[PDB]
Structure 1
């Protein structure tokens, strides 16, 4: 259980320490680009003037994945940098970096230091305004920036912060869309506060040259997948409701979601190109709500999960996309007895259940039956409640099936100090990875898993696993233990470098990082033989339709646990889809339909169903009864859809009409 011969020698000469002399304040890390190895470390330290110690704003750069750093503070002329704006990194490998400076009180405007070459050269630029927000890059064009001023003006730059033009004077919120489209809300009188729900949603396509109003009486708006959502307020009422556009505001449509009051919120939990998970807050100070899943138009919503945990005013939620397996999401629900249970869906919210517990795990004191229970997961909520949880769940899309999380085994989330659990099949089965709380990182698309023990005392040991968490080996990475703070590694989980951050034991503490290159641990490159065939979502091996999720199967080529080798940076996850024939279970009920296995017409259109029916587009009122699940790719088999009805006359048949 640990076949890495002489790992100490393979690591000792690959351990690179960097002590950060003259650091006393907060620290921010930013990676600049992929496969560049560039890391920027920013610090800002404010000191009272009656203290002989001066302030400090340092800036360090690395280009070897954190092995060595260079103090490049001279490049920003040793200027105080606004902590709140941090480091505005450009998209992808544009190498764009923008830092905002603190300017003296009374200045005409603010100023920024810009770099378009991965922080090798910086330039000053005095702004015609004082920034209120972090500058935002256009996804389509890194040279395009926008920002809100302290006077709530919207400013746009076409030349990467060089020159700026104000394009609107009373803006509350502004976002980049596709093709350099800007969406922004505006107020008429007073402020964004006073015009709560009385905002106007505008859009510009030509970078401020022209505009179009695309919504009035606006509360707020959001972007998710191909969907533009706006919450609109009622008339002579203080409720609001979701409207949605897929043509960037040219045409809108009222969603089949309940309207909410002032103390309620909507939350776009997750959105892709096929659909959106929408959380609606429950009336009252409940701290829970209901998850709805939409069709591919963001219009018809089916109830997916009740009593979904999500605290007041949209605080903390445990809703997690398990990104290492298609269709898998975990979250927390609130029981009737005010305990919290974790639930997992494998088919994009079509069905939820409890997580299967590890074969060997015994049950908590939370478990009424000592022998039978389930696994529950610590996430954002547990962390907020000051439980001993150092990390939320982790998963990376290039590490197929792998999920790592702090949890507990019983009938509910335990307040006890949690061990760490791992799944390799995307959530179906679990095993205790390590005992006690740890920080964890995935390297080389699953090729290596790294873990640091969470302690209140300084540590000097890192743990690694080359077989996806089954077996572990410990490595002492420094002579003098450090107070651990964090793990840094290149986004994408493809590097073989990991950085251990922390401060020395002290006579004042000094920041220090130890970066380890595992290049000699996995001295062999993976070959075809090192991979096996793996059907995802397999529940019943002999079944002809085993692994069918949303219409199809996917067979992967996974690295063998036993195979100790490097996947490589350019590693491509190999998978083959098999398209399953459609059954009724690939279809969701359209508007005005429900199923008590076939979708049957509703006799009673009540609640928001009735609201939709009375105020919606006849296009959505004419249903087939059935609609195919978004993202579902089944071919052939059954097909229960048509155009049969027109439900407008149905609901209006009760009302007397003029």
Structure 2
């Protein structure tokens, strides 16, 4: 360990300073498209008084991954941009930026500045309304925009915000579906807060020319992968139930899920083409609830995890899709003793379990036994309680296996200052990566992991690893230390450019600055076929025939070798071959009406929300797990 020599030379010329405006202003960063290098930076000075009197927005634009910027404030004339709305960037490489300008007193509608050539040219456009929300793009067409007004009217544009037309008047919530469909709720007599529970859900397939009332007595709605969800109030009651439609609200079916009071809430934790994870808050503001995984129809729900930590009103939950490995999800749970623990599922919420203790760790003060304990992960709740946690867990799909996160090693989540931990196998095994809290980033699909220390002092050092966090080279990137604020790499983790943001120590003033580093010379050579190695995902018992079967299949990957030092590339694709396992009874979840004593699904004599689902239809008592792809073997 410590392999590399003369790396300082290879990074010195590739480090790129850029000073911006002083700390009298506030910076806001936004990327525009993949493989572009196009970053926008909006400096904003505001001294807010009784009315608008002083304020200045400047706009900068890079196109070399943030190494150099050109001032483009002239392209928005001399206009103040409202940060609240932000930089509405279009999907894909559409190159469609839209800013929202402040307007004078008594103006009938607001103003926007909009480019569609990666911020090379903007054009001014006065609106017929004052917008309330940021302008949502349609995913199918980047020229199609919806926006909500300050008078609750839903406006739509076909020509990239050039001309707008009010499709409907009394709109609360609205969002795009597939094929340019617009689902939205609307009120009748009183406002959204008052009419909450007696709203009605509308649909338009043709940009508001035609309409269809797809639901009534609505609390709210949501889109989750293939499914359309709607919370619906029980008539002559304050309770509500979740209803589901797979055909854009033409036909509905009530979900096999409990009804909830007004104190409680449902939450779409995660959703794909296969299934949904649904949180249901336990009544009486207890601060937890219950995860339910759906079937492929989104209708029958198995109870996945009890006592799931989710704070009141929503907002805070530690539920984390580990994107670097299939079927893996980490979250936090409350104990009976009121201590928070971290559970991991490897089979999409079939079985949950504690995380394995890392090799290079002692068990902390929370642990009963000094030698035997588990890993616990800091995420959104830890951050909300103001613990010394600079980042939530990080994983990238293209960096297969890699999960980086802060944590504590014991019987529960500890208030003490955490170290950073890494798994290279999607969270089966763990290791202490770095000592004390850091900010972290994955570059080149795992080829380089980068880390900056979280410090009250200013800093001038960046730690990097070419062998997935086992060995760490330390690089001094500036002679003048900075108070670090954040990192910015290109989304997708395919770049080799990291931008270290912060502000200077106090001289005449303090000023915003970004040191951008390219690692292209550190990984001078591209990776050949010899650099990769065969890796079975989910391996427990290598000698076993069913080893690595999760949702009825295995996956053998071509992972990059740790010792190998090379660029994966931008064009890099995750090479994997699946092995289809034989079906067992474990590959089938129990259909409605059936359960497991012990493991075989057997009918039940029906209480609670089961009885309600039965009353308000035909089955052998088994159904295939959604996304389960086993063939042959057991079959009821």
TM-score if structure 1 supplies the norm length?
0.95
Q: CA deviation at 1:26?
A: 2.2
Q: CA deviation at 1:54?
A: 4.7
3-state SS of 2:429 partner: coil
Partner of 1:627: 623
Q: CA deviation at 1:190?
A: 1.7
Instruction: Write the distance in 1 (CA, Å) between the matches of 2:307 and 2:48.
Output: 49
Q: CA deviation at 1:315?
A: 2.1
Q: CA deviation at 1:337?
A: 1.0
Q: 1:52 to 1:149 in 2, by over 3 A?
A: closer
Partner of 1:542: 543
Instruction: Write the distance in 2 (CA, Å) between the matches of 1:149 and 1:94.
Output: 25
Q: 1:363 to 1:233 in 2, by over 3 A?
A: same
Q: CA deviation at 1:21?
A: 3.0
Aligned length: 634
Q: CA deviation at 1:360?
A: 2.9
Q: CA deviation at 1:580?
A: 0.4
Q: CA deviation at 1:23?
A: 5.5
CA contact (8 A) 2:111 2:126 kept: yes
Q: CA deviation at 1:412?
A: 0.3
Q: CA deviation at 1:2?
A: 2.6
Instruction: Write the distance in 2 (CA, Å) between the matches of 1:176 and 1:54.
Output: 37
3-state SS of 1:303 partner: strand
| 1:587-635 CA distance string (max 9 Å, x none) | 00000100010000011x00000010110xxxxx212200000000000
Which stretch shows the higher mean deviation, 376-385 or 357-366? Answer: 357-366
Instruction: Write the distance in 2 (CA, Å) between the matches of 1:48 and 1:384.
Output: 28
Structure 1, unmatched stretches of 5+, are 616-620, 640-657
Q: 1:303 to 1:48 in 2, by over 3 A?
A: closer
Q: CA deviation at 1:362?
A: 1.1
CA contact (8 A) 2:187 2:200 kept: yes
Instruction: Write the distance in 2 (CA, Å) between the matches of 1:70 and 1:48.
Output: 28
Instruction: Write the distance in 1 (CA, Å) between the matches of 2:47 and 2:366.
Output: 49
3-state SS of 1:558 partner: strand
Instruction: Write the distance in 2 (CA, Å) between the matches of 1:402 and 1:48.
Output: 45
| 1:108-134 CA distance string (max 9 Å, x none) | 100100100000000000000000110
3-state SS of 1:519 partner: coil
| 1:477-505 CA distance string (max 9 Å, x none) | 00010000000000000000000000001
3-state SS of 1:529 partner: helix
CA contact (8 A) 1:441 1:450 kept: yes
Q: 1:231 to 1:518 in 2, by over 3 A?
A: same
3-state SS of 1:545 partner: coil
CA contact (8 A) 2:39 2:66 kept: yes
Instruction: Write the distance in 1 (CA, Å) between the matches of 2:166 and 2:43.
Output: 31
Structure 2, unmatched stretches of 5+, are none
CA contact (8 A) 1:4 1:521 kept: no
Q: Is 1:601 paired with 2:598?
A: no
Q: CA deviation at 1:508?
A: 2.1
CA contact (8 A) 2:304 2:349 kept: yes
CA contact (8 A) 1:461 1:476 kept: yes
CA contact (8 A) 2:23 2:509 kept: no
CA contact (8 A) 1:23 1:43 kept: no
Q: CA deviation at 1:46?
A: 1.4
Instruction: Write the distance in 2 (CA, Å) between the matches of 1:120 and 1:140.
Output: 24
CA contact (8 A) 2:21 2:43 kept: no
Which stretch shows the higher mean deviation, 17-26 or 293-302? Answer: 17-26
Instruction: Spell out the pairing of 1:555-570 with structure 2 (5 A cutoff).
Output: 555-570=556-571
CA contact (8 A) 1:354 1:374 kept: yes
Q: CA deviation at 1:234?
A: 0.8
CA contact (8 A) 1:34 1:93 kept: yes
| 1:239-293 CA distance string (max 9 Å, x none) | 0110011100001010000010000000000000000000000001210000000
Q: 1:554 to 1:508 in 2, by over 3 A?
A: same
3-state SS of 1:306 partner: strand
Instruction: Write the distance in 2 (CA, Å) between the matches of 1:52 and 1:585.
Output: 64
Instruction: Write the distance in 1 (CA, Å) between the matches of 2:561 and 2:383.
Output: 34
CA contact (8 A) 1:280 1:289 kept: yes
Instruction: Write the distance in 2 (CA, Å) between the matches of 1:50 and 1:300.
Output: 55
Instruction: Write the distance in 2 (CA, Å) between the matches of 1:280 and 1:43.
Output: 41
Q: CA deviation at 1:363?
A: 0.5
Q: CA deviation at 1:638?
A: 1.1
| 1:7-38 CA distance string (max 9 Å, x none) | 10000000000000355222211100000000
Q: CA deviation at 1:56?
A: 1.5
3-state SS of 2:46 partner: coil
Instruction: Write the distance in 2 (CA, Å) between the matches of 1:634 and 1:65.
Output: 44
| 1:143-162 CA distance string (max 9 Å, x none) | 00000111110100000000
Q: 1:538 to 1:55 in 2, by over 3 A?
A: same
Which stretch shows the higher mean deviation, 50-59 or 347-356? Answer: 50-59
Instruction: Write the distance in 1 (CA, Å) between the matches of 2:27 and 2:326.
Output: 36
3-state SS of 1:217 partner: strand
Q: CA deviation at 1:3?
A: 1.8
| 1:53-77 CA distance string (max 9 Å, x none) | 9521111100000001111111111
CA contact (8 A) 2:287 2:309 kept: yes
**CA RMSD, 1 decimal:** 1.9
Instruction: Write the distance in 2 (CA, Å) between the matches of 1:309 and 1:429.
Output: 24
Instruction: Write the distance in 1 (CA, Å) between the matches of 2:266 and 2:307.
Output: 14
Instruction: Write the distance in 2 (CA, Å) between the matches of 1:341 and 1:293.
Output: 20
TM-score if structure 2 supplies the norm length?
0.98
Instruction: Spell out the pairing of 1:96-115 with structure 2 (5 A cutoff).
Output: 96-115=96-115
CA contact (8 A) 1:32 1:93 kept: yes
Instruction: Write the distance in 1 (CA, Å) between the matches of 2:452 and 2:366.
Output: 28
Q: CA deviation at 1:378?
A: 0.2
Instruction: Write the distance in 2 (CA, Å) between the matches of 1:599 and 1:550.
Output: 18
3-state SS of 1:46 partner: strand
